[model samples]
Target chain A: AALRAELRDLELEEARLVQELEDVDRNNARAAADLQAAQAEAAELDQQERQHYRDYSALKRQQLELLDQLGNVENQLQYARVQRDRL
Target chain B: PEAAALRAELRDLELEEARLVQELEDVDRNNARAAADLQAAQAEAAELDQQERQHYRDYSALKRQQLELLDQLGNVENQLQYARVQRDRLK
Candidate 1:
């Protein structure tokens, strides 16, 4: 009778363990899917970020060119003003 | 006539200089907007990276737990089998 009772308790533990195992399996599956999506999103973000930097660099170059042109125009204005004043 | 021509040239140069300055300001605004967008993207990517790492860790831990549970279940089955055998012998 004691042995029978022990068997019943062991069987209950077995069932509980099986149920927990299934739960863990589902959790693992969902976690894996989440990780995959996160990685893909990160990749997309990385691409977007790189483009932003490139755009920034191009803008910086444009700014430098504009500064050079502005400097030339300012020098021309100063020279023109001096010539006008001398006349 | 020479003085009048020089004055006209000076005015034209002044206008050109003003235009260039305005263009430079526009470029500066675009640069600021680009920089802000880059910063935002970096922040979001960093957060996503952290979340991805956490998910990996959680998955790994769950896998380990699943294996442990499987071993425990096997042990319980073995014990249960032996106990049943012993009980049947009593008959």
Candidate 2:
């Protein structure tokens, strides 16, 4: 009878633990899926950011080149005026 | 003007990207915690299974012993009944 009682207790404990393990496994799977989704979204956003930066850099470089060209033109105009006044 | 607009758009995208990165980090943290919990649960389940198996083995042995004892008792009862029958014949 004592042994039977002990076995009953053990069986109950095993049942409880099995339930807990199942619950934890379910939650773990859900968390893993969520993490995967978040990671994928982050990767996509990172790619877009990289492309945007590339375009921005290219545009800034073009703007700088235009400014340099305009400055050179002004210098040439001033030099021509000085030569005409000297003649 | 177009450059300014582009810069504004870039800034918005950067903000969005940062937000997504943060979300990813949060999810990673949650997953880590969940994994730990799962490990603990599995360990507990293993321990319980071991204990349960031990109890079952012990219970089975006890049941076998009880069955053997009952068989011996039945043999003793049959011998006592035969002795009474011989006494009645002698009388």
Candidate 3:
């Protein structure tokens, strides 16, 4: 009976991790679109006048920030997948 | 002999139980780490949203300044053209 209980708990943990992994995947997709739009807008702004160029520069900075955040999310996704495989 | 056999079986069962317990511990640790990651990602996303709004406001202010500068620039050019016309008339 005790061994059976342990098996049940392990299965629950596995399910939980699978759900989390899926959530991370969805977030990653949304982030990719945001980065894409930011880049597109920045490029258009770059072709304009001085004020627009400054706006482009600001957008680029935000893009870099988003890129860093995306890197972090990807790292978490990788680590979690490794853990799932270990299970 | 039967008692000895029963004891051996119990020992094997004990080993199996220990292994299962260890596996559970590992799974729990991984689950906790996963939860932490989710929370961190969520917080970062919220911060990004806040920053985006702030950027929009900043851009709006810059746009207002640009419009004012454009008007001032046009007026300065008009003044210069008028002065040149006066000088040409004197010449």
Candidate 4:
């Protein structure tokens, strides 16, 4: 009779373990999915950041070209004034 | 050996149950940290993008000013040339 009671108790433990195993499996699956999504987001962000850097560099080049043009125009204005006033 | 067989099976189930419990705990702990790291990365990325937009806008305004200055200098030079021509005609 004692062995029989012990058998019943072991079965109950088996049932509880079954339930817990399922819960663990579900939790792991969700965590795996979360990691997958986060990696995807990181890739997109890095791509977009690279594009932004390109745009920013282009603007700087344009600004430098503009400055050179501005300086050249000022020189032309000075030469024209010298020709007009002194000559 | 009759109860011995049953006891061995029970021990196996207990071990399996413990492993699952440990798995669940580890998953929750590590996933929580991963989620925090992801949030921080996204937030940092968004802020950088905003700064990029701001720089572009500022550049646009500066470009407009540069063009206007070019136009003004061209006119001044044209005036100087015209004055030179008129003085030659007077002589």
lDDT of 2 by residue, B1-91 (tens): 5555545555655555455555545545554555555555556555555655555555555555545545554554455455545545657
Q: Where in model 2 is the C-alpha error above 4 Å?
A: A1-87, B89-91
What does TM-score give for chain A of every model? 0.76, 0.81, 0.48, 0.67
lDDT string, candidate 1, B1-91, tens digits:
8888887887888889889889999999999999999999999999999998998888888889889998998899889889988988999
lDDT of 4 by residue, A14-80 (tens): 4555565556556555555555555566578887556555554555565455556556555654554
Per-residue lDDT of candidate 3, residues B1-91 (tens digit): 5555545555655555455555555545554555555555556555655655665655555555555555554554565455556656656
Least accurate 10 contiguous residues by lDDT in model 3 chain B: B1-10
TM-score, A chain, model 3: 0.48
Q: Score candidate 1 by lDDT.
A: 0.90
What TM-score does prediction 4 earn?
A: 0.41
Off by over 4 Å in 4: A1-87, B1-6, B89-91
Q: Each candidate's chain B TM-score?
A: 0.63, 0.80, 0.57, 0.65
DockQ category of candidate 1: medium
Clashing pairs in 3: none
> Once model 3 is optimally superposed onto the true structure by TM-score, how far is the C-alpha of residue B15 displaced, in angstroms?
2.1
lDDT of 4 by residue, B38-64 (tens): 566668777666655555555555555
lDDT of 4 at B2: 50
Over all chains combined, what TM-score does candidate 2 have? 0.46
